[PDB]
Design an enzyme around this catalytic site. Sequence first.
Site, PDB file in Angstrom:
ATOM      1  N   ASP A 236      42.088  24.641  24.305  1.00 36.17           N
ATOM      2  CA  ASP A 236      40.641  24.176  24.153  1.00 36.17           C
ATOM      3  C   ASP A 236      40.453  23.564  22.625  1.00 36.17           C
ATOM      4  OD1 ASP A 236      41.151  25.619  25.810  1.00 36.17           O
ATOM      5  OD2 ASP A 236      39.429  26.916  25.777  1.00 36.17           O
TER       6      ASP A 236
ATOM      7  N   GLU B 212      46.441  37.396  24.947  1.00 34.05           N
ATOM      8  CA  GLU B 212      46.665  36.139  25.126  1.00 34.05           C
ATOM      9  C   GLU B 212      46.907  35.281  24.543  1.00 34.05           C
ATOM     10  OE1 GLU B 212      41.969  35.138  25.394  1.00 34.05           O
ATOM     11  OE2 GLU B 212      42.521  32.462  25.736  1.00 34.05           O
TER      12      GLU B 212
HETATM   13  O1  LIG Z   1      32.054  30.665  29.936  1.00 35.50           O
HETATM   14  N1  LIG Z   1      32.848  32.085  29.766  1.00 35.50           N
HETATM   15  O2  LIG Z   1      33.186  32.510  31.333  1.00 35.50           O
HETATM   16  C1  LIG Z   1      32.424  32.826  29.040  1.00 35.50           C
HETATM   17  C2  LIG Z   1      31.442  34.017  29.362  1.00 35.50           C
HETATM   18  C3  LIG Z   1      31.283  35.722  29.338  1.00 35.50           C
HETATM   19  N2  LIG Z   1      31.158  36.929  29.747  1.00 35.50           N
HETATM   20  C4  LIG Z   1      31.437  38.142  29.526  1.00 35.50           C
HETATM   21  C5  LIG Z   1      30.303  38.945  30.639  1.00 35.50           C
HETATM   22  N3  LIG Z   1      29.664  38.164  31.768  1.00 35.50           N
HETATM   23  N4  LIG Z   1      30.018  36.988  30.409  1.00 35.50           N
HETATM   24  C6  LIG Z   1      31.842  35.664  27.541  1.00 35.50           C
HETATM   25  C7  LIG Z   1      31.781  34.322  27.540  1.00 35.50           C
HETATM   26  C8  LIG Z   1      32.160  33.338  27.966  1.00 35.50           C
HETATM   27  N5  LIG Z   1      32.559  31.893  26.919  1.00 35.50           N
HETATM   28  C9  LIG Z   1      33.931  31.448  26.839  1.00 35.50           C
HETATM   29  C10 LIG Z   1      34.208  30.117  27.367  1.00 35.50           C
HETATM   30  C11 LIG Z   1      34.874  29.031  27.130  1.00 35.50           C
HETATM   31  C12 LIG Z   1      36.764  29.510  28.201  1.00 35.50           C
HETATM   32  C13 LIG Z   1      37.941  30.173  27.714  1.00 35.50           C
HETATM   33  C14 LIG Z   1      39.445  29.757  27.346  1.00 35.50           C
HETATM   34  N6  LIG Z   1      39.798  29.729  28.273  1.00 35.50           N
HETATM   35  C15 LIG Z   1      41.611  29.701  27.571  1.00 35.50           C
HETATM   36  C16 LIG Z   1      42.019  31.116  28.957  1.00 35.50           C
HETATM   37  C17 LIG Z   1      41.749  30.180  30.272  1.00 35.50           C
HETATM   38  O3  LIG Z   1      40.703  29.182  29.880  1.00 35.50           O
HETATM   39  C18 LIG Z   1      42.398  31.073  31.402  1.00 35.50           C
HETATM   40  O4  LIG Z   1      43.064  31.760  30.947  1.00 35.50           O
HETATM   41  C19 LIG Z   1      43.140  28.896  29.889  1.00 35.50           C
HETATM   42  O5  LIG Z   1      43.252  28.455  31.367  1.00 35.50           O
HETATM   43  C20 LIG Z   1      42.971  28.357  28.383  1.00 35.50           C
HETATM   44  O6  LIG Z   1      44.216  27.160  28.662  1.00 35.50           O
HETATM   45  C21 LIG Z   1      42.542  29.103  27.485  1.00 35.50           C
HETATM   46  O7  LIG Z   1      42.875  28.389  26.476  1.00 35.50           O
END
Ligand SMILES: O=[N+]([O-])c1cc(-n2ccnn2)ccc1NCCCCCCN[C@H]1C[C@](O)(CO)[C@@H](O)[C@H](O)[C@H]1O
Length: 765
Positions: A538, A735
């Site tokens: 990220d 994680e």
């Molecule tokens: O954006 N939302 O869904 C979200 C939903 C809620 N929320 C809670 C209740 N209801 N909603 C709260 C906050 C967020 N923001 C976070 C978005 C950033 C993405 C995370 C980073 N990605 C990680 C994990 C993987 O993505 C999957 O393991 C890997 O693929 C990747 O490599 C790795 O770095």
Amino acid sequence: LHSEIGRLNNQSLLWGPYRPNIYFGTRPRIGKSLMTGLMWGKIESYTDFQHTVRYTCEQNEGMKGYGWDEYDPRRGGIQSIHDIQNGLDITTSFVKIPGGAHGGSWAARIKGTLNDDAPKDQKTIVVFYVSQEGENSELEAVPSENEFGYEGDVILKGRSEALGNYKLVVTKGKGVIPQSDHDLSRLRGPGQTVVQSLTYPDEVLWQAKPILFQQLKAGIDWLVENKYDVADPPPPWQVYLLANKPGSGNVHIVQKVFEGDFEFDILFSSESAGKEVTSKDLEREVKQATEVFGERFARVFDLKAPFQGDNYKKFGKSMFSNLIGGIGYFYGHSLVDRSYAPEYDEENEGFWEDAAEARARHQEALEGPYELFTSIPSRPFFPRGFLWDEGFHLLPIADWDIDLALEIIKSWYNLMDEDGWIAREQILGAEARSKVPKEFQTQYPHYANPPTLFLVLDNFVERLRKLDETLSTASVDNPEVGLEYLRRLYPLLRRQFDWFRKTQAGDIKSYDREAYSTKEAYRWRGRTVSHCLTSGLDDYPRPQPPHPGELHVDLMSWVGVMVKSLISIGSLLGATEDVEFYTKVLDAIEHNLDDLHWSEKEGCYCDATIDEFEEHKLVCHKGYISLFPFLTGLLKPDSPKLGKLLALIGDESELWSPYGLRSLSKKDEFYGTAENYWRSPVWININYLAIVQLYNIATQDGPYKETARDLYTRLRKNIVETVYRNWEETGFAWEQYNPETGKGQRTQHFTGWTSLVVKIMSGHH
Ligand SMILES: O=[N+]([O-])c1cc(-n2ccnn2)ccc1NCCCCCCN[C@H]1C[C@](O)(CO)[C@@H](O)[C@H](O)[C@H]1O
Ligand SMILES: *[C@@H]1O[C@H](CO)[C@@H](O)[C@H](O)[C@H]1NC(C)=O
């Protein structure tokens, strides 16, 4: 024979607890069908139940832990839930009984045990919620003899085109049923199992909690209207016991109240099979599933020293069972921006501002419906398909059951659009959307993700070259079957490869760039000033500012990974014109990695930009990115560059911590800055790639053999012990891991690629 194995596999995999987003529930791999769900919660007051009730997965201070102790999607398994807030330890056992024409039968046992701290006379409400989507389907609760509800079992009789005839039975169960001396009992009974049979529009059937609460609220409204008041209130549990009204409908709520420990069964009998399933069937098959699981685990996951101990075996079983237990079936529409706005081309300086303007036009619309059968990073936090994650999830799963893994790969490729795009995050249906802020639902056709599913295919090809048990390896045992699978998939793989080169192409020709090839150069789309989410890493530091002439060494390395795979698969299929083209591309990537990406001054690979003066510049941030050609298996085992990378990997002052390889070097100016997500923490997926490549160098003759052997041994031990130590203390896979303290951090229940540790322990790549 391929069609025959196809049909057998369909039948074997049809039913599962394929709703990993909730603690316990079942659905078949059919978009619009019968689904089941469990809810429980203590009731101590007139207001507490709305706060105590459990349904969708969470992780907070009120939940000690939960997960699958054993699981195989063909047979079922046992799940353990440790609920602090509700003072309960719950076991859900699930089991499949093959037979008939409709994917067979199944049963579940729900067992609740009060923990030591719980009041010995706690009242617990338990609900089994059943719903059915379909136009011509029917489901009917056979009414009880008794006036007010059920003394014995609740029987639901249903029919659908997909399931034919079936009966679903919720048994009376064992455990004290509380009784009320209140006047209200004259009208509602003194306390018994009840059923409400309801109908709602098909598309809202997934909203079990709100549907339950609306029924409860109408119940309480009835109380007030009928003069049951605070002068003399019925007990809280009786206030929250639905009035019995069974019937036909597309929703059935089965509610029980228990005092103290309880247990009950759910038996699903496919009519087209033999005699109906019994409780005695359930216990027997449960016993048998465990025996079979134990045997397969010892064959498939033989844990090598120093992890042969029973402690490590338990750790391995848990990590594996949670990964394979996370498999879900998803179905519904997706939010996709299909404008292909020109700002998304990102061809100008400042492009991130133009792209945001285009996103703010909000042209996205729902499309589909789609379906997906996939494992998931995390039940509580990420309960849906992630493209590059799945590549890692399937490495351990493919060892267990190649036919399962191939099925999942197929599920994923069936999503691919005519251009070759697969959305990197798969949010299918209103249910999946409920867990995701709307701003973050929209998928963008120009956004890629690492094509890690190719790695699983590589493992499959190598195996191919070199009754459930039979099914699980059918695709390798019958070589014609495997090749037929590849024959169908190969064109989709080629399409994705072409999509990468059309959509993620970098710019050589328009700058002062000397290189062996004018074609091979790559740039992740979708990058902001601080992020490159599409790369999967990220917040890993990239060139500043973002610039259309950037080139990303990791992306090029993945393109390398793909060609290699297409070379292997094309040869098998005799696509001679293809293999010749790929061969030239592999040659070109090999030179251009050196020409555009290698830094002699720094001794590692590097991303590139274009200067203030329009000149090609390397921007080096030592970390995972720097190692990419090595991690992806593109470097020759005698290469001087490899030697330098091994020096970087093993350097304590840079990447090498007691707990594993840091994502970024301690010497980098961005170490532990901002969100510090990929800017120091130890990540098991990338460590896994390192370990596998180290082992590869260690098991061939060559100059770096002994260096690699040393690093392999220690890194394997460091990574395994880190994950184990945290599992032991916290019950969770995490994680990522802190390189200073060793502590797991960020998302809990990350099973998830952290579960690769089972493969790391079993060795012998
Ligand atoms: O954006 N939302 O869904 C979200 C939903 C809620 N929320 C809670 C209740 N209801 N909603 C709260 C906050 C967020 N923001 C976070 C978005 C950033 C993405 C995370 C980073 N990605 C990680 C994990 C993987 O993505 C999957 O393991 C890997 O693929 C990747 O490599 C790795 O770095
Ligand atoms: C497997 O699932 C169902 C059962 O027949 C069917 O609709 C589906 O298409 C099957 N797979 C294929 C591609 O036949």
